[PDB]
Symmetry: D2
Subunit: 500 residues, 4 copies
C-alpha cells in the first residue's frame, strides 16, 4: 500500500473483485477477436485496409488531443459542495444563498496561469481557483484567483500581458525582457507584482491558499435593491508557502505536486475547506470611495469593509476521469443566476465575452452538453438548436421560434436585470494614470514584516536581473515611487548581479 494516487489501478482491479473482464469492442460495439496483431498478407507481408480494428483504434488515438486552455492550462480538479452557514438574503435573492444549511454541489479547478500542460506545479505564478455551483437557477461560475487583484485594469491589454508572460515568438523561450518591458511600461501592475514576488507567489499546493472573486460584483435582493460585493474564500487549512529552494527542487522531483497533494488529501478523507465571505459596499459608498471601486488593481480595506460570513466550500470527491471532468470543464464568469450580476469593472466586462468564446473553440459549440458543464440541477428550455456534436434530444419537436402560439418556453419577468443610469460620453477613457502606488505602499509597509520585505526584493531582483539595463532602470523607478526603500533594495541587488 503506497499513497492512494499510486494505487489507482490496484484499487480499480480490487473493486472489480470476482467479475470477468468485459469483452473488448470497437467503438461501434463489435467484439474484437485479437487486438495484439494486425492483418497482413502472410507473416512478412503488407497491412490490409480491412483491418478496421486497427484503423478504428488508431484513428481515435490520432484525435485524442484538444487545444489546451490559452491560459491556466495546467490544473487539478475536485468536487464537493457549498453550504450556507449565515443569512445574506437581505443582500441577494440568489437561490444558492436561500437558507441556512442549503447545500449546492460544486466543481473546482485549480491552476497556474502561464505554464503549458506539461509544466511544473511549484513555480511562481498566480493560481486560478474556479468554482462552479450547480444551482436550481442554473450554473454559477465564480472564476477566481488566489489574489484579490490583477496586473492590469483594462481588458484590451490582457492578450499583450499574457503574450509577455509566455514564450518569445521566434525562440520559443521565456523572455525576461518581454516580462519586464511590459510591467515597467504598465505600473498599474505594481500591486499584483508585489503580491506575486512575496511568499504567497508559491503556495504549498492548492489546499493552503485563499481564493477571491477579485472583481466587484453586484448583489440584488428580492425588493430589487442592489449593493456591490467582493467574494473571498479563505483556506481553513491555513496559508502555507513553499520556499524558493523547495519549490525549485519539487519542480524537478514532482512537476505534478499540486495534483498529487489534492488527490491524496481527498482520497484519505482530509477534505479541504474554505470559508466563504463577502464584503459589501453600498452605491453611496461607491460614490465616495477614494479610488475607483471597480478597479481590479485595488482592494477594499477590511477596516472600512469587513468580511461578512456566508458559508463554506468543501472538496470531498476526486475526479473519476481527469479528461472528462477536469480537462473539459468550462467556467464562464457570465454564468450568474438571478441575484448576482456584473459590475462595471472593465476587466469583468471583457471576461463576459471571452470565456464562452474560447470555450466554443477549445471544446466545441455544444460544450455546455458535456456532463461536467451541464446545469443538471436546472431545466434548460430555450430556442437554441443544432450545432456540432449535439448529444442530447435537441429539445425534440418543440417550437423553435419565439414568440410563438404553441406553448413553448416563456420568459420570466422576475429574472430581469437591475437598471442603472450612467453618465458620460461613449468613448475610450484612459485609466493608465489612476493611482498605481498607494495600496502597494500599504502592503509593503504595513502588511509585510522585515524578513518578508527582504525576500520580496530578492525574488524580484532574481528575475529582473535578466532584463536589459534600460528595462531594469524603468522598473526600479516604478518601485521607488512605491517606496524609496523598495526601489533602493532592488537596485542594490541588481548592482551585485550586473557586476558578476
Amino acid at each position: 500500500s503506497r499513497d492512494p494516487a499510486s494505487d489507482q489501478m490496484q484499487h480499480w482491479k480490487e473493486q472489480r473483485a470476482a467479475q470477468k473482464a468485459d469483452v473488448l469492442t470497437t467503438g461501434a460495439g463489435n467484439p474484437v477477436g485479437d487486438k495484439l496483431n494486425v492483418i497482413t498478407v502472410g507473416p512478412r507481408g503488407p497491412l490490409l485496409v480491412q483491418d478496421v480494428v486497427f484503423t478504428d483504434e488508431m484513428a481515435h488515438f490520432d484525435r485524442e488531443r484538444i487545444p489546451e486552455r490559452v491560459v491556466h492550462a495546467k490544473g487539478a480538479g475536485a468536487f464537493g459542495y457549498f453550504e450556507v452557514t449565515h443569512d445574506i438574503t437581505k443582500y441577494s435573492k440568489a437561490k444558492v444563498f436561500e437558507h441556512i444549511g442549503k447545500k449546492t454541489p460544486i466543481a473546482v479547478r485549480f491552476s497556474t496561469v502561464a505554464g503549458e500542460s506539461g509544466s511544473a506545479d511549484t513555480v511562481r505564478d498566480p493560481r486560478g481557483f474556479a468554482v462552479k455551483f450547480y444551482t436550481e437557477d442554473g450554473n454559477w461560475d465564480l472564476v477566481g484567483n488566489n489574489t484579490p487583484i490583477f496586473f492590469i485594469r483594462d481588458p484590451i491589454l490582457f492578450p499583450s500581458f499574457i503574450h509577455s508572460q509566455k514564450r518569445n515568438p521566434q525562440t520559443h523561450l521565456k523572455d525576461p525582457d518581454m516580462v519586464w518591458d511590459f510591467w515597467s511600461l504598465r505600473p498599474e501592475s505594481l500591486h499584483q507584482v508585489s503580491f506575486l514576488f512575496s511568499d504567497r507567489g508559491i503556495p504549498d499546493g492548492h489546499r493552503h491558499m485563499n481564493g477571491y472573486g477579485s472583481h466587484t460584483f453586484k448583489l440584488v435582493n428580492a425588493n430589487g435593491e442592489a449593493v456591490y460585493c467582493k467574494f473571498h474564500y479563505k483556506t481553513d487549512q491555513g496559508i502555507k508557502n513553499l520556499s524558493v529552494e523547495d519549490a525549485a527542487r519539487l519542480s524537478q522531483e514532482d512537476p505534478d505536486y499540486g495534483i498529487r497533494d489534492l488527490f491524496n488529501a481527498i482520497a484519505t478523507g482530509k477534505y479541504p475547506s474554505w470559508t466563504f465571505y463577502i464584503q459589501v459596499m453600498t452605491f453611496n459608498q461607491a460614490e465616495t470611495f477614494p479610488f475607483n471601486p471597480f478597479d481590479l488593481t485595488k482592494v477594499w480595506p477590511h477596516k472600512d469593509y469587513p468580511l461578512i460570513p456566508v458559508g463554506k466550500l468543501v472538496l470531498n470527491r476526486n475526479p473519476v476521469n481527469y479528461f472528462a471532468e477536469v480537462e473539459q470543464i468550462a467556467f464562464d464568469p457570465s454564468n450568474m443566476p438571478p441575484g448576482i450580476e456584473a459590475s462595471p469593472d472593465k476587466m469583468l466586462q471583457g471576461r463576459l465575452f471571452a470565456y464562452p468564446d474560447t470555450h466554443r473553440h477549445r471544446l466545441g459549440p455544444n460544450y455546455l452538453h458535456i456532463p461536467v458543464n451541464c446545469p443538471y440541477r436546472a431545466r434548460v428550455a430555450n430556442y437554441q438548436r443544432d450545432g456540432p456534436m449535439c448529444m442530447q434530444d435537441n429539445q425534440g419537436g418543440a417550437p423553435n421560434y419565439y414568440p410563438n402560439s404553441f406553448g413553448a418556453p416563456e420568459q420570466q419577468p422576475s429574472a430581469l436585470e437591475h437598471s442603472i443610469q450612467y453618465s458620460g460620453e461613449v468613448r475610450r477613457f484612459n485609466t493608465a494614470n489612476d493611482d498605481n502606488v498607494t495600496q502597494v505602499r500599504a502592503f509593503y509597509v504595513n502588511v509585510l514584516n522585515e524578513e518578508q520585505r527582504k525576500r520580496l526584493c530578492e525574488n524580484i531582483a532574481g528575475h529582473l536581473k535578466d532584463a536589459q539595463i534600460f528595462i531594469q532602470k524603468k522598473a526600479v523607478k516604478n518601485f521607488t515611487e512605491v517606496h524609496p526603500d523598495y526601489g533602493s533594495h532592488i537596485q542594490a541587488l541588481l548592482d551585485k548581479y550586473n557586476a558578476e
Copy 2:
C-alpha cells in the same frame, strides 16, 4: 386537421395540454427575464456586452450548421425493426439472424446522391437506402442503394465520378460535358447508366423502391465455414415510379416530397416494409462465375442464385428531431458484427476507409457517442480515450493500455475474422476492360419491354444532347456496343435535338 406533417406544432401543443410553459433559460440554465429586447444605453443608445442573453443565443445560432454529407446530402429518416422470419444460421452466426421471430431495432436514412441539402427529392438519381441494425454484437450498418450495381468498379475513381456529377468548379453549374465526358471515358458505367435512365431512376418516394447491399459480402457460420452473399430488400408496397413530367412538376411544387410522404405514411399508421433476402454463392461457384463475382457493375442472375428469404424491415417511428436523428446519423460499412465480413470487392474495400474518415470530419472524433449512432444494445469497453466533445464517462478510471494485469477488457477469440489465401503480386491491376456490356444487353433486351426501351433512350438523349458532339459520339459508340438498336435510337434522338 391537415396532414400530420402540417399539424406537427399543433400536436405538440395539444400533448402539453394543461401544463404551464417551461421557463426560458440560457444554455447554462439561468432564467431569462426578457428575450424580446436587447440592453442599450437609453432607448436609442448602443448595445452592451453585458447582454449575455443576447450573445449566448446569437453565438449558438452562429454555429448551428455542420458540413453536409459530401454525397447523399438530402435525406429522410425513420426508425423501426428488423424481424427474422427464416433460419439462415447455416450461413451466418451473426446474432441479428440468431432465431426466428428475433427483432432488432433499426434506423434508416433515404437520400439522393448528387444534390445538396436544399435540392429537390423528385430528380433522376440513385437513391441511398442505409440501414443501421442495433444488435447485441454492436451496430451493423448496411449502407445500400436502390440499385444492385454502381457506375464504377474501382474506388480511386469515386471522387472523380462524384466531381463529374456535381458543379463545375468555376461556374458552380451542373455541367453535361463533365457528366458525359466521364461516363463516355468509363464504359463500365453503362450498366448503372441504363438503370438510372429507366423508369426506376425516379421512384415515387422512398416506400416504392427496393434496396440492395450491392456488394458481395461474406457470411461465416459457427463452424467457421464461409460463403459469399448479396443482400436484397424488396419493397412490400410495390415498385412505383414518377413520370418525368410529374417529377419535374413536383420538383417545383414540393422539393421535399419524399420526406413528407414517408413522414405522413408513418404518422397515419401505414408502416412501410421490405422483405429481406440473400443470394448465396459458394467459394467454388465464385471460382467458376463467368465474371468477377466481386465486380460492383455485375449482378448474380436470379436463375443461378435464387433469393433466400431471411426476414422483414418495418418502419414504424418518425424522428422526433430531424437534426439529432437524421442529419447526425452516421453509417459505416465497416461496422459488421461477427458472422458478416467484407469480400474483396475493391469498391467495398475503399468504403471501409472512407466512411469513419468522413464522419470524424462531418460530425467529430466522438461521433459514435451521438445517441443515434451509439451501439446502445451492446456494451462498449476498450482502450480508446478522450478526443473532443467526450460526452460520456470516458470509461472512468479503467486501465487504458492493453495488455494489462488489472482486469480491463479482453479480446474474444471467437470473434476472429475468417482467413483466406490469395494469389498474385501486390500491384495495381487494370479492370477498365472487364466485360462492360453483357449484363447490360440482358437488361435492355430481356428485362425492358418496348415502351420502356423507348423512354430509356429519350431520357438519355434529353441529357446527352447538352454535351459537345465529340462527347455525344463517344457515348453513342458505347451504347452501340451494348446493342446496335440502343445506340441508333439514341443517335436518332440526338440528331433531332442537335438540328434544332
Copy 3:
C-alpha cells in the same frame, strides 16, 4: 459554341493550347504512376494500406465540405471596382471616397436568405447584396440587401425569425404555421412583408435589383463632424421582375438561373453596374424625425432626404474558382474604415458581433488570411498571433505585446472613433409597439398602383392560406390596421381558398 458558362472546360483546354498536361501529383508533390486502379493482393484480393495515393485522394474528398452559411447559403459572386464620381469629402474622410475618379477593387456576393446550398434561385425571398471594398485603410464590407428595410427591429429576434423561415425541427419541412405565427405576432414585419410579396420579391436575376445598406450609418469628416447616412446602390440595368409563373417554371428548369445569368453577362462583356448614392441626415434632423431614424423597419422619405450621388459599382470579372472566391468569402459589417462608423441601430449593433463570430466557425479562426478576404491593399500589422491554419509568416519575429520598447506597430490617434453622449438607463427597452403601419400605408396607397395591389394580396393569400385559421385571422387583423382594403382583399382570397 454554346453560352460561355457551358463552354467553361472547352475554353480552359484551348487556353492551354499546345502545352503538355501537368504531371499528376499527390498533395505532397510526389508524382503518381497510376490513379485509375488501387493496389490489391493479386487481381481479386483485398486493398493494401500502402496505397497512399488512394488514401491521400480519398481523405481529401472526405473533407471537401464546410458548413454552409447559416443564412444566405445560396449565392453568386463577381469582382469589379467602385469609382468615385462626385465629392462627398465634406461628409466623410474615408479614403475610398477621397477624390473623383478614384477606383477601389470590389468583391460582390448575391444570395437568397432562407434556402440551403442546393435550393432554387428564382424563389420569393429578400436578396443579399454584399460588397467588399478593398481600400488602403483596410476592407470595408457593406453587407446590404435588395430592400432598404427588414422584418424586425431588435437583433435578439433574428434567430427566431430565421428559424420560423426554415424547416420544422421535427418534419424538416417548410412550415406556413411557423412563418405566419411569427409574422402575425410581430407586426413590425408588415413593412418588409409588403415589399416581399410585391413584384420585387422575385427579381429577374441579380443584375435587375437595387441594393441598400438598409441601416443608418455614421459618416465622419476630417474636422471630426458627424452625420447619419443611408447607402443606396441602384441598378443601371433597370428593375425587372419574374412573374410568379415564370419563377415557378425556372425553379424546376434552372435552379441556378441567377448564377448563370451573372456569369454569362460578365463573360460576354455586358458588365452590370449600379449607381451609388447616400442620403444624409444631420444630428438635429435625427432629433426631430417623426420615427426612430435608427429603426430598420423605416425608410427616410426621399422628399425630405434626397439621394446624393457618390459613384458607381461595376462588375467586370467572374470568379476563377467558385469555392475559393465565393463560397469562402466573408463579409463583416464591423469592417469599416475611418470616416464610416456604426449608428445606434440595434440591429446593426447585433451584426457587429454575429458576423466575425460565425466566420470563425464556418471558415476558421484565420479566415481573414484566405486570399479573397485579405485586406491586400492595406498593411496588416498588429499583436495577433497563431491560431489554426496560420498560412502566412505570422508576423515573423516581431514583438507580440503592446506597449513595447522595441519599435513594433503603434496606434494612430487620427483613427479614433467619434464620441457621443447618450441619455438614459442601461436596460431592455421595448420597441415592439413603435409605429408598425404608417410607412406601410404610404407604400400600399402611393407607391403601388391597382394591378400591383391586387398581385400583392394574391401573393400573400397564396402563402397564408396554408396556416391555421387562428393565424390567418391575426395576420388579416394586422393588414387591416395598415389599410381596410389591404386586409379585406386578403380575407376575400382566403375565404375562397379555405372554402375549397
Copy 4:
C-alpha cells in the same frame, strides 16, 4: 550583449533601424486609434459591443491554441540543406540522390516522446529527429528517432504503449505501474528499454545525438531493381550525454535547454551537421537473415551490413516564427518520392495511415497548404479540391475529374511502384514470441563496458522500484533471460530500494 536567443527582440529592433513603426491595424487592415483602453459609457460605465477593436483582438487571442501533437509534443526546429557526397544511383533513382554536390533544402524538428508542450527537454526519453527534404519530386519525410529500434514491433500496440507512458486516466499522474506493467508483459521492448536506460537516454541537446530511419525501407533504381535499406545520420559534433544529476538540475533551471542550445549554435555560426549513410540488404540476404529483417526491434549488424556514405545534413537557419515553422510543421512517412518505398515492416505500414490522419485533426484538412509543409520545389497538380481554409487558388478552373478529355493533369507511368509476390494467408500473425533477447545480449555484453552496465542497472532500478512487486518480478525475469547478471544486478538494487 547576452546570448543571441536572449537578444532576439533587441536584434529585431536594430534591424528596423530608422524606420517608423508600422500603423497598428485590425485583422481587416483598418487602422486602430487607441488599443490601450476599451469603449465604455462614461469613465465608470459598462463596455459596448461596438468596441470591435477589442472583440477582434480578444476573439483571436481566444483561438490561438491548436491541439498539441499526440506524441513528440515538445520540440525544437531548424532549416538547412542536404548535400549528396557519394553516388548511390545504383540503388535509388530518387532525384534527391541524383548527382554529387546536389543540394536539397531541409526542415528538421527534434523532440521528446511522452512529455507535453510545457515539459522539460533534459529528461530520459527517445528523441525524435524528423527531416523533411523539399525535392523536385515532392517532399520526402524521413521521420526518424535517435535510436535504430523501437519498443514494439506491431502498430496496434502503439496507442497502448503511449498510454502506458503518459498519465494515469484518473489521477493525471505519471504511473510506474503502467509503464512497467506494459513493458514486463511485452518483452520485445527489452532492446529499446536497454538503449533508453543507458547513457544515450539523455543526450546533451539535439546536436550530440544520431538519427535513424529505424525501419527497413526499399530503394528502387532506374532499371526497376529493388534493395532494402536502413538510413543512419550520425552526428558530426560527436555523441555527448548528460549525467542523470546534470539532467535533473537542468530540468528545473532550463526546461528549454535543447531549444536554446540549438538556436544559439546556429545564431553564432556553429552549424551542426550529420553524416548520412545507408545500409543495404538484397532480397536474397533478406531471405537468409537470421531474424525478421523488417522487425523494428532488430538492427542489421554493421559487420554484415556496412554503412555506405551518401551525403550530409547541415542546419544553418533558425525559425523566424516558431508557431508557423515548427509548431505547424507536419511530417508524413508516406511522403516518399519515386526511388524510395515502404518495406513490409508492420510498424512502418501503420505509420503510413496514422500521420496524415492526425495531421488533418491537429492542423486541418488543408495542412499541406501551410508554407512550411508545402512541396514548394515541386508543382502540385491533381483532382483534389476545396476543404476548410483553402488558402490557394484551389487549382482555378481546371477540370476536376479524371480521366477527362480537356488536358488536365496526367499520371506518369515511370512513377509506378515496385511489384512483389507475397506468400501466405491474409490473417493476424503473432509476433510476440519472435527473438526478444539475442541482440539485447550483444548490446549488454559487447557494446557496453562495465561502468556503463552499472549505470544502466541503476537507471532501470531507480524507475522500476516504484512499481508493485509482482511487476518488478516479471520485469526482472525478462532481464534475466537477456543475461543472468543483468537481472541479478537489477534485483540487487531493487532489494535495497524495497527495504528502505
